[PDB]
Write a protein of this length. Structure first.
Lengths: 230, 125, 103, 63, 39, 213, 94, 23, 59
RNA sequence: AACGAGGAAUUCCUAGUAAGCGCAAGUCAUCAGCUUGCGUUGAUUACGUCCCUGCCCUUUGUACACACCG
């Protein structure tokens, strides 16, 4: 009735960066994530919540805020997720300070927090990081703003707790064809969901129960994979 | 005497001398016929005055054009202004004033840079 | 795929249409119309690409049996297209119909 | 959805509006009676036709 | 997708580099000093 | 019937001028190939603002069109396309190369789509020039985007800048070149068929305005 | 305006000369018998002709169109225009 | 801070509201 | 719409005559400028309460 | 072995201007790691506003009609 495709080598899906501004895909940003540099004096370091608190205090900021653990764990589950195997989403980190980060969907996030932090300080001072084969820069700090990096046909929502709840399967089936999605998550420890409410349209909720950013990201990932049959 | 007339044309830093005298209906620009001006996209801009007016009025005269200085587009605008003012002057001198006026009206209604140039002096506040 | 471009200038690949991943066997133009190109690919389906929107086939043509290798238009009509398969059954399709089934 | 057209008549002034926002009075084109105060983002002069989507609302100060 | 791994953390050539930087710095500094005292 | 005579000896010259140029004299066409009769803006509120009243030979009228407020609005449209095509990163100031690119694009459009290339340009402009925009409101901290209408001149300038920027970003890192992809993008723009860069951006603009009305 | 001289022939062709150089410019052909009367308006817009084929012809002169073609019964023999009132009188054959 | 015209309009608004209510 | 509310306000003053005679010049100048500017819409309208309001304030 | 147009911040600019391309000189202070002349090519977007940021000026009609306010 209809021929099979000519070649049947199961090829890798086409890898994606932001330079493609056409293909329908998914993008997750981590908003207000805390990744801060400091120079202890004889070593630069990433600010960490538990171990250094009085030096946070002598700087004067809030130990209730300065915590990259949730960023690391959310990043781990996202870039581990099976849609990231299917090659259909990429990561944008919008720091608490303001730096744009494009994370390629081919990197392998270091599993332990110390290695992750060492990578992070190398990034935040160096601006680019190459692979072990050294021909592709996997991490790209880039220029504000993010909507001047996104694809053209996108809808932009935030993930808030107070918002009315929907089924993300329903939402992705409500979408149009070339209309990609753009979900802003709040990776703050404890703060108000007012970060990108001039950027994006509408707020969304996934339960009447509060979550973490991590399990919210997992919920959105699996609603995505069920909506796209992958 | 030979009924003759002479005019100048001027873009930013170029000069276009145009002799116009009665003749057999030809054009000459720098000792080369005007199918061979260089820039080849502005050749039509050089052609502009002839195609604005018609062709018989240039069938009964003789032009001789010589340009110096400037660059490409500057020379080209210079030649077109020179041809315009020369044709108008020849008509004014040897044939009817009414023909001169209808020529002038058609030109200036199209584009005034043909009859007067603008040497661009700045405006300081 | 097909590649279409104006003659005398190999430098300018004017338009590059990726049809089915099977080999496109034959490509022709309309005769009466002038902006509709037809490709028979070995996928037993022939497609009518409107040369303005090259992204999708303006009209499919299916129902064939195996290896459509030739096709021809027709003089009086610009709507009636003849396809030659590779197992016989020279088929005659309409375009101003729905067009999935042959006339 | 019905689009409509109007004519910018008279540029208003002295109101405290942001740079790049100008408050102006339009008369509806095909219906020669209703005038509405609206805003514009680009430069406007007297007497030019202008496109309108929303019907009912009159504009205001934009702080 | 193919994945990768991140990268983060010639002795005589680099020693030549540091000696050249020290030579440049010292010559420029002494030039400044001679200029000042002579003036 | 009745006939006007203005001719009594057929024009002979000593330096022969080709047939194309003769017919150009009897009717001005842009690059001698495209007329200006049967060219119209299909929508009002732009007949004033995209001038196709006066014919032109080549798109390089070097007049002073930017001293006053609206001499920009007076300037003819294909001039604006060459200019915004020249506005570049590596290529600021090569207008001759730019206008040759315009001519190449114009031929590509006329070859592919039948109707009239310059008509395609004008209809594309009036179909993509956005209608209802937003701006920032300060408000003193509780800031947001608010929706206003937009002037015709801003519509024209916005539509043109978007179209050329879409063409350049299409031919940024690709095997296609600017003239080709601008031709395709313009044809789809006059089609209004939702695959053009400017079309996507326009509907995105008006829906932003809709969302925070 | 003192520039244009009008000759009305005996085969119909109205011919327009410039009188500075004595040169020929324009030629109209409407009537079929001899032309007998020609005049031009004081504002140099319109042109009146009348001929023994019973025909009065109205022309523009800024353009070169045919405005009007009127047919009367008798042929027309004599013509006088008057410019200040824009009225013209024909002497007929009845 | 409210501008002339705007202050007049909203004050006129309230006054006309009360008068029309009493009528 | 605020023009319409202005006219009703004037008619209520004409009911309360004593507030009139201390501000007659201000009333007259503002009223005449408002109508002379907004004339076209106001005259192309049709409203019998508006007609009666105009009649009473005229008298 | 670094490197694919160079983040955060920050500086400037409204027509022969931004930018690009070169040729010449080397003028009692400066400049040769450069400095200054001249020509070529020639743009997009504002030309309105005091709403934010700051700055100033005036709060006494004083000056001679009419007008305006008081």
């Amino acid at each position: 009735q209809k021929a099979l495709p000519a070649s049947l080598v199961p090829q890798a899906p086409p890898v994606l960066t932001s330079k493609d501004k056409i293909t329908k895909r998914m993008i997750v940003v981590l908003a207000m994530a805390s990744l801060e540099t400091h120079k202890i004096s004889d070593k630069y370091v990433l600010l960490n919540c538990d171990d250094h608190q009085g030096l946070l205090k002598k700087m004067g900021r809030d130990i209730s805020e300065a915590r990259p653990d949730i960023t690391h764990q959310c990043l781990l589950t996202l870039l581990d997720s099976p849609i990231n195997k299917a090659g259909k989403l990429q990561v944008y980190i919008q720091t608490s300070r303001g730096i744009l980060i494009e994370v390629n969907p081919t990197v392998r996030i270091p599993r332990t927090f110390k290695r992750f932090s060492g990578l992070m300080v190398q990034l935040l001072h160096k601006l680019s990081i190459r692979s072990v084969n050294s021909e592709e820069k996997l991490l790209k700090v880039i220029k504000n703003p993010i909507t001047d990096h996104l694809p053209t046909k996108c809808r932009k929502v935030t993930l808030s707790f107070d918002a009315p709840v929907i089924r993300v399967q329903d939402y992705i089936e409500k979408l149009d064809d070339d209309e990609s999605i753009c979900v802003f998550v709040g990776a703050m420890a404890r703060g108000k969901d007012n970060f990108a409410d001039e950027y994006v349209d509408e707020k969304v909720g996934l339960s009447n129960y509060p979550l973490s950013a991590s399990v919210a990201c997992s919920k959105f990932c699996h609603g995505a994979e069920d909506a796209w049959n992958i | 005497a030979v009924p003759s007339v002479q005019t100048f044309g001027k873009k930013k830093s170029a000069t276009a001398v145009a002799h116009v005298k009665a003749g057999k209906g030809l054009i000459k620009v720098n000792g080369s016929p005007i199918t061979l001006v260089e820039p080849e996209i502005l050749r039509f801009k050089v052609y502009e005055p002839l195609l604005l007016v018609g062709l018989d009025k240039f069938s009964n005269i003789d032009i001789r054009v010589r340009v110096t200085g400037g660059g490409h587009v500057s020379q080209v605008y210079a030649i077109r202004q020179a041809i315009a003012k020369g044709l108008v002057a020849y008509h004014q001198k040897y044939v009817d004033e009414q023909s001169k006026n209808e020529l002038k009206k058609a030109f200036t209604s199209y584009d005034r840079t043909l009859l007067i140039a603008d040497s661009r002096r700045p405006e300081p506040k | 795929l097909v590649s279409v471009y104006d003659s005398y200038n190999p430098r300018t690949i004017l338009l590059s249409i990726n049809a089915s991943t099977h080999p496109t066997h034959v490509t022709k133009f309309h005769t009466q119309d002038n902006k509709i190109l037809a490709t028979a690919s070995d996928d037993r389906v022939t497609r009518l690409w409107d040369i303005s929107n090259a992204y999708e086939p303006q009209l499919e043509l299916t129902g064939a049996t195996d290896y459509v290798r030739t096709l021809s238009f027709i003089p009086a009509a610009p709507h009636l297209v003849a396809t030659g398969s590779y197992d016989g059954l020279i088929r005659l399709y309409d375009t101003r119909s729905s067009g999935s089934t042959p006339i | 959805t019905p689009v409509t057209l109007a004519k910018v008549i008279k540029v208003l002034g002295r109101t405290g509006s942001r740079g790049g926002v100008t408050q102006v009075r339009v008369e509806f084109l095909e219906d020669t009676s209703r005038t509405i105060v609206r805003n514009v983002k680009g430069p406007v002069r007297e007497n030019d036709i202008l496109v309108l989507m929303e019907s009912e609302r009159e504009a205001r100060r934009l702080r | 997708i193919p994945t990768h791994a991140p990268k983060y953390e010639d002795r005589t050539r680099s020693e030549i580099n540091k000696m050249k930087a020290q030579l440049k710095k010292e010559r420029k500094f002494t030039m400044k000093e001679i200029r000042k005292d002579a003036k | 019937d009745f006939e006007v005579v203005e001719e009594f000896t057929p024009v002979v010259l000593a330096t022969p001028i080709p047939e194309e140029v003769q017919q150009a004299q009897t009717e001005i066409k842009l690059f001698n190939k495209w007329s200006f009769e049967e060219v119209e803006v299909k929508d009002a509120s732009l007949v004033d603002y995209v001038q196709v009243r006066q014919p032109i030979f080549v798109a390089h009228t070097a007049g002073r069109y930017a001293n006053k407020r609206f001499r920009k609005a007076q300037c003819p449209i294909i001039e604006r396309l060459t200019n915004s095509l020249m506005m570049n990163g590596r290529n600021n100031g090569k207008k001759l190369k730019a206008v040759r690119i315009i001519k190449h694009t114009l031929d590509i459009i006329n070859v592919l789509t039948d109707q009239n290339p310059i008509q395609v340009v004008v209809d594309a402009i009036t179909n993509t020039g956005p209608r209802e925009d937003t701006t920032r409101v300060g408000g003193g901290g509780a800031a947001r985007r608010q929706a206003v209408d937009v002037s015709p001149l801003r519509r024209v300038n916005q539509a043109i800048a978007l179209l050329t920027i879409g063409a350049r970003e299409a031919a940024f890192r690709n095997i296609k070149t600017i003239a080709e992809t601008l031709a395709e993008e313009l044809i789809n723009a006059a089609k209004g068929s939702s695959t053009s860069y400017a079309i996507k951006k326009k509907d995105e603009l008006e829906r932003v305005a809709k969302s925070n009305r | 305006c003192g520039n244009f001289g009008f000759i009305g022939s005996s085969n119909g062709s109205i011919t327009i000369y410039n009188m500075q150089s004595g040169i020929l410019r324009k030629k109209y052909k409407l009537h079929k018998r001899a032309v007998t009367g020609i005049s031009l308006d004081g504002m140099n817009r319109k042109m009146v002709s009348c001929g023994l084929d019973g025909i009065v012809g109205f022309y523009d002169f800024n353009k070169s169109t045919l405005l009007g073609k009127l047919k009367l019964d008798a042929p027309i023999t004599a013509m006088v225009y008057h410019r200040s009132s824009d009225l013209f009188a024909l002497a007929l054959d009845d | 801070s409210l501008k002339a015209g705007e202050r007049l309009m909203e004050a006129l608004d309230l006054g006309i509201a009360e008068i029309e209510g009493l009528e | 719409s605020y023009v319409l509310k202005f006219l009703k306000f004037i008619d209520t003053v004409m009911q309360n005559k004593t507030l009139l005679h201390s501000h007659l010049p201000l009333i007259c100048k503002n009223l005449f400028f408002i109508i002379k500017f907004n004339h076209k819409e106001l005259v192309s309208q049709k409203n019998e309460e508006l007609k009666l309001q105009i009649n009473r304030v005229k008298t």
